[PDB]
């Protein structure tokens, strides 16, 4: 449901025990996202979709 918040600028997901962050493939819609924070999680591979 975060994919619909087109006006987001900061996303903080501290200590959410995120394992896979492949949902980055859907964050290109947000034209104002500048401060994606994913610290304090358990993520292995940064997805190729950062581009």
């Amino acid at each position: 449901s975060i994919f619909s918040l087109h006006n987001l600028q900061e996303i903080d997901l501290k200590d959410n025990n995120l394992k896979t962050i492949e949902e980055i493939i859907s964050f290109q819609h947000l034209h104002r996202l500048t401060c994606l924070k994913l610290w304090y999680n358990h993520i292995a591979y940064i997805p190729i979709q950062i581009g």
Partner: nanobody
Amino acid sequence: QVQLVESGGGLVQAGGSLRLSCAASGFPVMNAGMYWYRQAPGKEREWVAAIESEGTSTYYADSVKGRFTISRDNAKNTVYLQMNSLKPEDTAVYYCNVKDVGDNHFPYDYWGQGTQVTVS
């Protein structure tokens, strides 16, 4: 509250397959290291199987490596253990163990009641 309990205890002659189980209360199983220990008459608690949190990697002792199978089922909030034609000398009382869950109070090691499985 935090408590550990397992089931599946039953005496089975050599030649069958027994499916153990467990039950964890008060914490998720994914964010915790679950352990299986064996207890035998006249013998102390010997480690058997361990499953690592945040990555789900299985760790086995050379005593029973390559025969057991451990899996974590977060749907039931439990840990399932399966044997593959365990030897008669493998009879023991199996203990579950989870240590240092996200909650940090005086009991740091939680053990199950204990189930006795017999092989003959």
